[PDB]
Point group: D2
Chain length 243, copies 4
Amino acid sequence: IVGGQEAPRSKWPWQVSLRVHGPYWMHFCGGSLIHPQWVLTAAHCVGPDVKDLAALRVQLREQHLYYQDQLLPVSRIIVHPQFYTAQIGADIALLELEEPVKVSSHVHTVTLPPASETFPPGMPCWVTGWGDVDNDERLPPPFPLKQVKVPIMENHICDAKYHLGAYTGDDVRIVRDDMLCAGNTRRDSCQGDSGGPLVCKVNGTWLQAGVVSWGEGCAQPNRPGIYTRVTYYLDWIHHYVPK
Amino acid sequence: IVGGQEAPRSKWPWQVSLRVHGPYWMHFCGGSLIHPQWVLTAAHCVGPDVKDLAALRVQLREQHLYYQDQLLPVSRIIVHPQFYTAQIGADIALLELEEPVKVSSHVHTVTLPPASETFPPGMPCWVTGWGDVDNDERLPPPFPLKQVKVPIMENHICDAKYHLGAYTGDDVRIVRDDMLCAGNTRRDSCQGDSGGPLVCKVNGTWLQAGVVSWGEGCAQPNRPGIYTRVTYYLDWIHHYVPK
Amino acid sequence: IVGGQEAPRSKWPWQVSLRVHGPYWMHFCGGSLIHPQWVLTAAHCVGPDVKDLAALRVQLREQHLYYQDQLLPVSRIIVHPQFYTAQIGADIALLELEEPVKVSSHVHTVTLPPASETFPPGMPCWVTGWGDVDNDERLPPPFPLKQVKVPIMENHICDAKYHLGAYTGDDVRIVRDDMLCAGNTRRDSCQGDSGGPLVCKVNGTWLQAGVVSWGEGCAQPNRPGIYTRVTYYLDWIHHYVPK
Amino acid sequence: IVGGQEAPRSKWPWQVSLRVHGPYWMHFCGGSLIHPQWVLTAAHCVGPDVKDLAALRVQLREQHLYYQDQLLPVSRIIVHPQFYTAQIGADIALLELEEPVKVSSHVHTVTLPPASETFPPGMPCWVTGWGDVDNDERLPPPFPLKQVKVPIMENHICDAKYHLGAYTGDDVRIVRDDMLCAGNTRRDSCQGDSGGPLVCKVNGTWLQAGVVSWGEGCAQPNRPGIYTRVTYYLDWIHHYVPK
Ligand SMILES: *[C@](=O)([C]([C][C][C][C][N])[N]C(=O)O[C][C])C1=NOC([C]C2=[C][C]=C(C(=O)[N][C]3[C]C4=C([C]3)[C]=[C][C]=[C]4)[C]=[C]2)=N1
Ligand SMILES: *[C@](=O)([C]([C][C][C][C][N])[N]C(=O)O[C][C])C1=NOC([C]C2=[C][C]=C(C(=O)[N][C]3[C]C4=C([C]3)[C]=[C][C]=[C]4)[C]=[C]2)=N1
Ligand SMILES: *[C@](=O)([C]([C][C][C][C][N])[N]C(=O)O[C][C])C1=NOC([C]C2=[C][C]=C(C(=O)[N][C]3[C]C4=C([C]3)[C]=[C][C]=[C]4)[C]=[C]2)=N1
Ligand SMILES: *[C@](=O)([C]([C][C][C][C][N])[N]C(=O)O[C][C])C1=NOC([C]C2=[C][C]=C(C(=O)[N][C]3[C]C4=C([C]3)[C]=[C][C]=[C]4)[C]=[C]2)=N1
């Protein structure tokens, strides 16, 4: 997370960390608890190639990575079939935990937005994760969970910005429809926050508007962060996660 | 190049090396001379964002990289407008040299295929360059130009193989129609060969069938090297390069 | 620490961690509290060249590095004047804290040995620290303080071992008289444990027999860990640290 | 070499490159031909630990490293028995080739100095090699042999400079008698140059005054390069090399 600060421990009770087996269970991506037994994340975090589930584990809300670990095994990795690369799209996936989690005020599910929700600009949204604090700059130990308020911008405004200083034809769409954008040169998600959640308080309730997907670098001029647009894939999600 | 051998001095007189400015004019991609003043390469080697021409140079056929440098300046970079990422497509670009090159037996242009040429699967073709000799395995000094005979494969077969061990739906195109594909687990192009040529001998004349584009690793199981089909973009090339 | 185990929270109340200013206060060496206002460490950790005090901090006993940080400024660095390199000798130094520390059962000084103590070869001693778990293998987060029982070995014997598989003449001393050694191919201290303590319990009292100094790799055959013999420099320490 | 330039092809016909087996025979140190069958280098290049001769080869004068390699096997590695680390001293060793090299105008031995030569300050000496052109930055390909004129300075003047900005006591000698120093903040040998020669034209003939041994960094303020003083080890050399 670029900009922002360490989040209070009472916030983002749905934030999760994905771990890959290695010299130690290292965090490679973020994710969110959308149901006691399911975790929503980015497809590029776990695919497009098939992974060995044994080498993967989930860590529920933690104020500091690795310090109070209670790794949870995974039984299924469901990746949207239209996915191949983040730039192309459909960068979304599901992880089914091996057991349901006991929810509480410190750890519970995030609410998904209704299919109608559009998240207009001037929309106070936040993004969180344990990713880099800048380009090629790791979150230093003790690895606190960070949060940052990011401005939502219209898809067409972002697509245009991405063509600035680029050879790509103006009519060749970069920021696609199943995508959503937010952030600026001071606030943005970065390597390590991927799969994590972008949430907005609407009508007094937190809804997950997006999933950290990609961007050209982090907080770079004319290159706002791109996120998978959750409302676009609700039907797919609900085909696995109970309503 | 993976699984190849050093190329004799008399072969591949069109192979060129692209240099970017830094502590020394370092090779970042390959290319091919298709006209005395034009170099054909891969768009991702120079795009999608616009580059400073002063930081770029072209080096004609060299038996060993860096040893006999005779860097040539570039006057114009033309990246196909439909390009954004190699996986999406249109990974082809043109480089216009400041001056036309004096052709000879050691250094001269390669012939472009005719719009109807259809390099069928099985046809022995060759790919060349100074790229890695294996995944994460750089080419050792003195950096000899390498070559390797790779078998071409039907577009649909390559696409199919890319779906094996992947979450991507079988109906979702991975190897697109503007791409060509060749190689196996023992022969393949690799990081550093990008923008380089894949040529085949047809009716006694060498034709460039492709441009090294992308691939999942190098010479990996069910992951043949993907190239930009030149026939697909002949009209775009002739909008600039004299026939 | 090689071949060790995480230390119980009630053990090694004198272990400290030295931090240097950068992206965060990173550990670079260990040390021991030998007096409320004094920390004993290795000269190569802070010398031979003079260092800016403002960029240095001390961290008292921590179960996990970076977790519960409460950094303490340093008022003075005293490096033995005879020190130039660890192989030459006199690898010992003193750190004076700006404020005296408030001891307790969880955080208190280690006892220095009397000038006659010898520490017989075979005397179970322990070495502690947050250094690597093996040659070129960092301690993985959450960075638990480690410990290992290492057997002390006679000075001549270690000097002898270092000659095995070496061109150095048998009469040329490698392990010198102001040094002590301990460990084997399974137990040793390693990069990051430097400046840390080597304690032995003599008649129900823990005495710091050594200071982690150097060695050829860690836990390598015939290359036992070398430490700065504390008894050898008691007079120098007492010229600064009160009784 | 720091602050020099490419050496003319006809100079330094005694320069040698030491190669270690690996993905390719890589250069790790320099050396000099002081006899048709012997190479003089630095002890720390091959010791203090005994090495497997097979993994070592020697390359004679070459304008560009790796370009025209004709690696010669080594039959014996003789390291001065008093050696353990460069700072301590006796940083000198001998390599006996498996066969005599045929000398010529382009490749011949360097002349060793008479036991009574002190090499006074001023008198021009040069140091050559394929090492870094500055701290932490390697010689760029095509790796040309570089040369540079370095001013020699009296041992005691350099010893004092090494004490500036350091804790080491003024009377604790750093630059030792069996050592010689040369260079400044703009001219010096660096990593990769070790074992190489420092030659001075005296009375119309080139004599090897020293061997690139060590230094605190390269071309750093008050830290001139240090070399093993050849005249000091003449008897030792002649114990193996004829006349
Ligand atoms: C993301 O953090 C970034 C988002 C940047 C936000 C801009 N505002 N996205 C990105 O880089 O996208 C490029 C298309 C991110 N960080 O790193 C990645 C890519 C990535 C995914 C997965 C791994 C990984 O190590 N996976 C493991 C997990 C696992 C494996 C491999 C094998 C078997 C079991 C489990 C590394 C990097 N995206
Ligand atoms: C290619 O070699 C590989 C091909 C693999 C074949 C497998 N069978 N393709 C690839 O990796 O594709 C990913 C989509 C290759 N190697 O490295 C790259 C990517 C790349 C492109 C360009 C640079 C680079 O340094 N460009 C310079 C040019 C320039 C710059 C930056 C600044 C100013 C002026 C000019 C690095 C890496 N593809
Ligand atoms: C030690 O851990 C090892 C011990 C190995 C035991 C074998 N059984 N010793 C070693 O490597 O010695 C070789 C002579 C160790 N690890 O790393 C070092 C060297 C070192 C010294 C100092 C720093 C450092 O970052 N210093 C800071 C302090 C400071 C600075 C620089 C600037 C301003 C203010 C304060 C890093 C590494 N020894
Ligand atoms: C020297 O170039 C420098 C000189 C600096 C001059 C400043 N004015 N010295 C130095 O860095 O000293 C540190 C005390 C140099 N560069 O690198 C080294 C150290 C070194 C020695 C040996 C190797 C090596 O790879 N050896 C091989 C050879 C061999 C091996 C290992 C195994 C089996 C057979 C043969 C690397 C680096 N000194």
